[PDB]
Amino acid sequence: RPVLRSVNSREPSQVIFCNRSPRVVLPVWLNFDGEPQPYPTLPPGTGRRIHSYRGHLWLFRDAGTHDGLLVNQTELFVPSLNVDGQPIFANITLPVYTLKERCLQVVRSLVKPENYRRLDIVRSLYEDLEDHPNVQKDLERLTQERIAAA
Amino acid sequence: MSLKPRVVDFDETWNKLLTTIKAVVMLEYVERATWNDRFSDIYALCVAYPEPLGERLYTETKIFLENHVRHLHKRVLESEEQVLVMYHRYWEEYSKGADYMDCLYRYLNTQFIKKNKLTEADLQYGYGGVDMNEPLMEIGELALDMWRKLMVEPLQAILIRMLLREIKNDRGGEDPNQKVIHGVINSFVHVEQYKKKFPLKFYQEIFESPFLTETGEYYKQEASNLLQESNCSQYMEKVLGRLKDEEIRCRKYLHPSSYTKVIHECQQRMVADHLQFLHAECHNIIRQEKKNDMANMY
Amino acid sequence: MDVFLMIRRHKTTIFTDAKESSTVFELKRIVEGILKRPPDEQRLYKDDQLLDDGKTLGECGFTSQTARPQAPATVGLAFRADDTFEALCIEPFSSPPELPDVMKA
Amino acid sequence: MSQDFVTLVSKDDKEYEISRSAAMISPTLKAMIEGPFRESKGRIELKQFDSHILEKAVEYLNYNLKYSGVSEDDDEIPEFEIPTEMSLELLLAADYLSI
């Protein structure tokens, strides 16, 4: 890690990620290099045991909307599993996909990027519906949560 | 765009906006007709589909608000404290005017400022005052940022002196209505920038320096007077009651940290400058018990 | 249960959060929460479902997912003196417009 | 007892009555009822947007209320589908609603 540092408390812990939404759990940690570390994907309804690593930015990126996602009611996940490994359940909130969020999602699924500019919405409604979430989004959110600050 | 024109829907919106806001710049009773006027105004502002229409909307809003506040600065050129509390009322109704603008602008708050603009990026359309006349932020904010030193510079040159004098007139004479002093300097300091980064920035700048000054001035001056000609046993009690009453006036107008600090400060100023008196009449009342100097000393 | 409805009094769409376990009273408040016209003195039914005051929005046929969130349901309008049925208005939202160019293709 | 309901209205006065509890989720409703309160007194007449569109836009607000009451993300909360046809106009309704 650079002069900018990352998770020091690191170790495999008894965990079981409980993907409890219709979307994939891509477990990721913003590593020492400020870079995403992916982990085995939990398909929809995938309870998979993990040697989960405490303090980590365990963002679980969905394959359905890939949004800012709340495992266990929060963007960040951490073990970390003990001698046996309860939740920890990485219980996956499929969020209650709101009106604007669900519009973003359907505009993701249906209209093309070439047709984002051709979208059947205002020039501003383009940005209102052309947003795309990223793994580095939850990476940076959990990095801020690692210190976070006021 | 598809539903209607997406840049010149601004036209009707600014028509309705100017109409109503001029009805509600520091005046007056906000008639319903204009209420539905702004209902349809933010109607057309929401369906106006603004790339510039929002930045230009609150552009023209800032422009008219600057114009009306310069017109009101044209009205601060009037008499003494008559127009001082006239201008008290000026912002009294003009903060209300910007407020019901903002009630006309509340749904418009949801519409054309809060998504992706000056409201989220202050380094794009201009800094946080209002803007460089392409602003995207709230409207009482506009009134404050255009009203602050209309209050500060021209008016407070004499209004602060009037304040000091009539506050001193707690001893005889009087301030305005004992919150109207408080209300006036709250109007003044309320442009502690509308986020209210400080409570003292404009508080300091506006009154707190003459505030602290004449606090100490009158305090230790009357301390000298009552030391001279009050039978210092009664110097004690006179200074005490006087300080309490003036601190009451410091509850008439009040910055709950300023006047506490400085009032008690300059009371100590009064009372800490009479030295050998202390032990001398101390051991006196120790022997010749006198619960003026007993009570006041203790 | 939080039924999700529109009490259309002459097209008066009222996207509300009423209560299933609550009686026909909530069918409104609220209209009777504001106007205080009793549930049996209003034929705000679930498609002409006779709503006695002993009935609830559950017994109104509505649920939080019958009178559901993702499309709050319709409440007919027939305000009666006591029970003299008024012309009850069952009004859908409308037929929505068509596909953007995609839609899918 | 602040109404307990606000009225989002479509086209030729097709009034959707939205419970206060949902209404408050829109800061825009909360502003409108307080700002031009002589006019928008728990009334938002988008007398041009169509009922079937407005219905979905307000149903989102209800859905949000349900989701919130649920708290734990999903207790039989369905997928908030939005057909392409809706999106076109629903964008404007959604913008006016401005959660």
Author numbering:
A (entry chain V): 60 to 209
B (entry chain O): 1 to 298
C (entry chain P): 1 to 105
D (entry chain Q): 1 to 99
Give the original sentences from the paper that presented this experimental model.
To stabilise the formation of a complex between CSN and CRL2, we employed GraFix27 (“Methods”) prior to cryo-EM. We next resolved a cryo-EM map of the CSN–CRL2 to 8.8 Å resolution. Although the resolution of the CSN–CRL2 map is similar to that for CSN–CRL2~N8 holocomplex, we only observed partial density for VHL and CSN4. We then utilised cross-link guided modelling to establish the position of the WHB which lacked clear density, similar to the neddylated holocomplex (“Methods” section). This change in CSN2 in the absence of NEDD8, leads to a structural difference in CUL2 which rotates upwards towards the rest of the CSN by 20 Å. The position adopted by CUL2 in the deneddylated holocomplex, places ELOB closer to CSN1, forming a CSN1–ELOB interface. In the absence of NEDD8, CSN6 is dramatically shifted away from its position in the neddylated holocomplex by ~40 Å. CSN6 in the CSN–CRL2 structure has its Ins-2 loop dramatically shifted away from its apo-CSN conformation, pointing upwards to CSN7B.
When associated with the von Hippel–Lindau (VHL) tumour suppressor substrate receptor, the CRL2 complex is the primary regulator of the Hypoxia Inducible Factor 1-α (HIF-1α) transcription factor. Activation of CRL2, in common with other members of the CRL family, involves a cascade of E1, E2 and E3 enzymes, which conjugate the ubiquitin-like protein NEDD8 (N8) to residue K689 on the CUL2 scaffold. CSN5 is responsible for the deneddylase activity of the CSN.
